[PDB]
Amino acid sequence: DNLVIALHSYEPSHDGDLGFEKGEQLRILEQSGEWWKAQSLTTGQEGFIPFNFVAKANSLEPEPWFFKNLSRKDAERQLLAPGNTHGSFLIRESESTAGSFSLSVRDFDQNQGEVVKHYKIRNLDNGGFYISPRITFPGLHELVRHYTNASDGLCTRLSRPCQT
């Protein structure tokens, strides 16, 4: 069920490598750290690919954090229910800037207890998203995977997806 698309052309260097093209559909068999095992859907060839040369070609709607048709002030109530906490987050289609996305994360502060902060995910050319121009991402899956492990810039760490 797990499918990626190649961002770059790669020409093998090690024995066991799979070579591939920009725009090629590969399917993942194993995820060992930095060299994943894949089968190309174009040739049928198998081998190890460099992890950062590919992005998830897997539907966003199955993902726990992605709340398709949701609105700013609701995202704030969605998060403000019991069952959630600081670090709880979600991504939602931008009602304002159509074509776009926003990030809603519950946060704590001494003073006004518990804010829910919104951020703007800016679009890149073709393969890309970002929140800080310092790091750019090929897809939403890769953005989310980076910030749940580091907060760099964000005013919290993305602890948990929103629980409905």
């Binding site: 902060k117 951020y119 703007k120 929140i131 800080s132 310092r134 005013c155």
Partner: peptide
Amino acid sequence: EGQYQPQPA
């Protein structure tokens, strides 16, 4: 635009 927070960079 219309802007939320300030873009962390």
